[PDB]
RNA sequence: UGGACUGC
C-alpha cells in the first residue's frame, strides 16, 4: 500500500533493445552457455544450481550455501582476477548502449552477471548485498518476459512464495533499474511462476572499493 | 519438484 510508492520511487524501466539487438545478444548467451558446458571457462566463472546458472564476468560473489556463516555482510567477492573478464561483446553490445542512453556513467560498471532460468526457476528474495555492489542496480532481461517482485517472503519443502508488495512485469529487452528505496530497504526474487519458458538477465553492477575479497 | 534474506 504506502509501501509500494516507495518502492515504485526507485524503480526505471524502458524498453531500449529492440528485437533484433536482443537476438544478437541472445545468441552471444547462446555462446556463453556453450563455452561453460565444455569447461572452458574458470571454475569460479560458472555456479550452477537445478533450474538457474549464474555466469560471473568481471566481477562476481559468493552467495547461499557457498557461504559457511549466513548472515548480513558475509557474501564476499572472488580474489582479484578469479572470475573472467567481461566479454567484449557485453561492452559493444549492452554496456555501451546504456551508456550512450545515459542509464549509468561512463566507466560504471565493473560486473557483469547472467542469470539464465530454466523454466519454473526462480531466485529467493534478497537484497543486492550492500557491502558489495553500489547503487543503482542495472537488469537486462532477454529471451521471454516475466516479472520482478518486491517484498516477498520463501518458504520451501516445497517452493511457496507469499503475495509481493509490489509485482513489476519485465519484458523482453528492457532494462530495469533500482535505486534508493527499491534497491536498499526491500528484497526483489523471481517466483518460479513467473518463468514460464526460458529467461536470462544480464545484471551490470559496480563493486565498492572496499568489497571484502576471498 | 528444483532454495540468497531469520535483514523475522
Ligand atoms: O532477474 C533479476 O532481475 C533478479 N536477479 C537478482 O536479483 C540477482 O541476481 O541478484
Ligand atoms: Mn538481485
Redesign the pocket.
Given at each position: 500500500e504506502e509501501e509500494a510508492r516507495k518502492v515504485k520511487s526507485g524503480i526505471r524501466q524502458m524498453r531500449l533493445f529492440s528485437q533484433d539487438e536482443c537476438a544478437k545478444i541472445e545468441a552471444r548467451i547462446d555462446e556463453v552457455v556453450s563455452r561453460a558446458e565444455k569447461g572452458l571457462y574458470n571454475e569460479h566463472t560458472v555456479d550452477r544450481?537445478?533450474?538457474?546458472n549464474k555466469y560471473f564476468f568481471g566481477e562476481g560473489?559468493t552467495?547461499?550455501?557457498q557461504?559457511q556463516k549466513?548472515?548480513?555482510?558475509?557474501?564476499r567477492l572472488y580474489p582479484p582476477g578469479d572470475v573472467d573478464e567481461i566479454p567484449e561483446w557485453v561492452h559493444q553490445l549492452v554496456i555501451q548502449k546504456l551508456v550512450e542512453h545515459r542509464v549509468i556513467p561512463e566507466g560504471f560498471v565493473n560486473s557483469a552477471?547472467i542469470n539464465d532460468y530454466?523454466?519454473?526457476?526462480?531466485?529467493?528474495?534478497?537484497?543486492?548485498?550492500?557491502?558489495?555492489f553500489e547503487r543503482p542496480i542495472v537488469s537486462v532481461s532477454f529471451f521471454s518476459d516475466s516479472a520482478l517482485c518486491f517484498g516477498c517472503?520463501?518458504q520451501?519443502?516445497?517452493?511457496?512464495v507469499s503475495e509481493p508488495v509490489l509485482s513489476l512485469p519485465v519484458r523482453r529487452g528492457s532494462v530495469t533499474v533500482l535505486s534508493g528505496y527499491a534497491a536498499d530497504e526491500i528484497?526483489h526474487?523471481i517466483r518460479?511462476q513467473d518463468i514460464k519458458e526460458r529467461r536470462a538477465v544480464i545484471?551490470l553492477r559496480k563493486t565498492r572499493l572496499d568489497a571484502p575479497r576471498l
Open positions: 544450481a537445478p533450474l538457474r560473489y552467495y547461499g550455501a557461504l549466513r548472515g548480513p555482510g558475509q557474501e552477471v530454466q523454466p519454473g526457476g526462480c531466485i529467493v528474495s534478497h537484497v543486492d548485498p550492500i557491502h558489495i517472503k520463501f520451501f519443502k516445497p517452493i511457496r528484497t526474487c518460479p545484471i
